[PDB]
From a paper:
Background: FabB (3-oxoacyl-[acyl-carrier-protein] synthase 1) is part of the fatty acid synthesis II pathway found in bacteria and a potential target for antibiotics. The enzyme catalyses the Claisen condensation of malonyl-ACP (acyl carrier protein) with acyl-ACP via an acyl-enzyme intermediate. Cells lacking FabB are auxotroph for unsaturated fatty acids, making FabB an essential gene for the bacteria.
12 Here, we report the crystal structure of an intermediate-mimicking PaFabB variant at 1.3 Å resolution. Here, the catalytic residue Cys161 of PaFabB was mutated to Ala161. In the Ala variant, the presumably negatively charged Cys in the w. t. form is replaced with a neutral residue, thus mimicking more closely the charge of the lauryl intermediate. PaFabB C161A crystallized as a dimer and has the same overall fold as observed before for FabB and FabF from other organisms. The crystal was in the space group C 2 2 21 and contained 2 protein molecules in the asymmetric unit. The two catalytic histidines, His296 and His331, are highly conserved and well aligned with the catalytic histidines from both VcFabB and PaFabF. Due to the high concentration of ethylene glycol (20% v/v) and salt in the well and protein buffers, respectively (150 mM NaCl and 200 mM NaI), 18 ethylene glycol molecules and 11 ions (Cl - and I -) were identified and placed in the crystal structure of PaFabB C161A during refinement. Some of these molecules were found to bind in the active site of the protein. As can be seen from the crystal structure, Phe391 adopts the ‘open’ conformation as expected for an intermediate-mimicking FabB variant (dihedral angle C-CA-CB-CG = 170.2 o). The C161A mutation of FabB in this crystal structure causes Phe 391 to be in the ‘open’ conformation and allows targeting of the intermediate-acylated state of FabB; in a similar manner to the natural antibiotic platensimycin.
Author numbering:
A (entry chain A), B (entry chain B): 1 to 404
The structure:
Amino acid sequence: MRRVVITGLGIVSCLGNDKDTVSANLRAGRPGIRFNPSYAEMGLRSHVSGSVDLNLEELIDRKVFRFMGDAAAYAYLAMEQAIKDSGLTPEQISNPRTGLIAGSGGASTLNQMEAIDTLREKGVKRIGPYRVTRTMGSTVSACLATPFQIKGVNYSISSAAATSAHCIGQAMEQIQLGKQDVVFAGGGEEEHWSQSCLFDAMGALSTQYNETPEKASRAYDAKRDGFVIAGGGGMVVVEELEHALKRGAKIYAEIVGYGATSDGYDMVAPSGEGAIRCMQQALATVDAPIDYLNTHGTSTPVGDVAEIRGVREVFGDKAPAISSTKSLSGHSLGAAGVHEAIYCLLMMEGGFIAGSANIDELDPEVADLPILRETRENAKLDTVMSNSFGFGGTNATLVLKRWQ
Amino acid sequence: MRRVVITGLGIVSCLGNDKDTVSANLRAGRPGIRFNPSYAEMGLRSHVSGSVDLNLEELIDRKVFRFMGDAAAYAYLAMEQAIKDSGLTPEQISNPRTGLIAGSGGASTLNQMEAIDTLREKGVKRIGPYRVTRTMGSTVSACLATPFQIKGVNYSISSAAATSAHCIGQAMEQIQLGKQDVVFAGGGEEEHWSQSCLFDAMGALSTQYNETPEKASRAYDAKRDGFVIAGGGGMVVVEELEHALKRGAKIYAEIVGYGATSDGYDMVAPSGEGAIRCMQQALATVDAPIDYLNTHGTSTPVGDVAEIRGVREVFGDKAPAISSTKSLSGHSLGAAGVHEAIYCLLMMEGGFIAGSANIDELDPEVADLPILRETRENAKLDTVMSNSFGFGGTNATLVLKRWQ
Ligand SMILES: [Cl-]
Ligand SMILES: [Cl-]
Ligand SMILES: [Cl-]
Ligand SMILES: [Cl-]
Ligand SMILES: [Cl-]
Ligand SMILES: [Cl-]
């Protein structure tokens, strides 16, 4: 089958809105989590978030921006970065063999709330004509494919925390089917109390670290108490290898493995069994040893351990270095898969492994695995794996191999 | 390349909640559209909908149903029907080589509204722990994969009106990649004023027929005035041919063509050009003449004609018989693609072409095309085509060939 590489990236996140800032914060171990006054004012129990600090209206053409909620807007800025990074020409961006596969976990709870408040107070006409494109499940793909004049595939995948990892794997598969040469893959996620309250109510979020927000997300720590919600966007340029070499592309990495499985077990907790099969499917096409695993690792009591049990079954006594970057970044939901793919690309480009932050007391149930608690500098980091596991028992695993 | 057939179906719709009732209403030309008092009470300008008449809480065990909104519930009941219809065994349904690809355009605006009303009036805990799975973009896949113990692929696609057509085509592609043998493909969509108001506010919906609701959806009629929103669910069993033959499956049709393209131009306005490329891509793998085209045909002034311009460019003087079944069913959004695939399968089983209803005066801009205004009985239907075109310039076309 045709080989597939990544030739450009872009990111909007609480760790930074450009690759150099994000790389630096991963290397230094600086969390992007902050206190969220709006959460406290609205009666949430979790008062922490990984929030993006941007004036989106000053960064995006108004004709484009009117159709967007924050999820699309974050993804759009990430895509602009990825296009610049990749050096693709307008004709390489806009042609039947170049596509877009990008999604979100939610869409825009804020625009939905505004629409209904408006209906009740002011009537239907005052809702305005832009709410469907901001709130539909395809908001991220629709709002990007249209202004970038994408002519190839155009759809969104939604698979909760697996969303943007499935997007990248499906971009690879569209190229392997022979249907596309270039696919923009990624995701976006709005961060607002109108979405975070739903997670608070199901008992998913951190609450015990509201006074020390930078410490709240602490995968593998004995005092972890739920995930820290986040927003943002990411996009990668997925490209067929011969196309990339012929145009003199920069090549970060080859996509060498991809798994997508289902637990068929519990709506909210991983089975561990599905994750084992997902990692094995990703590894079935990989000959090189795995140097680093970026876990799903959300800072939840059950989930962090269940995934580690699966890692132990897959690798036995030969596990790779492991960290969760969610201890720094929080959980960007639909954006988590592409964010973590990007973090892994930046680690390989920079020759370092980000440590698993905020571990005061390593959970004894994971202490036999090589959980990296500090940055590994001067790392010969060639082959990396990232897991993304969402509600509904949906699993995604990507394996990337550094291009020399 | 592996061949792909459809071996089971299920449907929840305003035309019926079983395939025999639906087939009868298609043949007789009986619309499912009714007056919606809640729309009028809430100040919408459109007072018509295609609504499902089911007591969902009597049909789905509460332990399953608590995680669902209506979109997932409709899809679940369609999947129960498709499982019975297919004759698959529990070991064939729950297997690493059996997957689920099913989505929605929205998810649950009703559950979002209830959650925020509850947060404001009663606080965060009273929202309850079920709202994320009801409202997340992957609600339809998550809420089915878990109880049916799906082990293979598991994710949603969201692409507006193309959603469940892309689900079917991607199910076909997973089988062609060699990754799955059976994939449940389809979609679901909630119908509620909290979603319909968004479409009303963009000027998309019919308003001139509120006193005569069954006449409101009237694709190609000179006095069409917008689409009629609907809800429901549909699911088809997409299966590798040798697997189907070995297990003695019933076989409706082979999937012989699939297109998926992007306009890369208008967020909402119909393109003509993207539709031409999508139909050509579907037809590139088809040698048989097309006997029938089920258009997207939403009963919009511009959209109906833009699509017919594309059909004229693709087929010229050899255009197939055409009808829009949306004049009967309304527009089920995320469920439209699988609903119309099912209607086409039922037309091939019954040897009839459903008439394009409610045409008092055929629009002169489409009158040169063979738009059937009445049901054709004793129709020799071997190869049928269905278009689904969504906001964001997303396009799908499926071509199905009757299995003799
Ligand atoms: Cl396990
Ligand atoms: Cl998660
Ligand atoms: Cl939609
Ligand atoms: Cl309470
Ligand atoms: Cl006629
Ligand atoms: Cl539409």
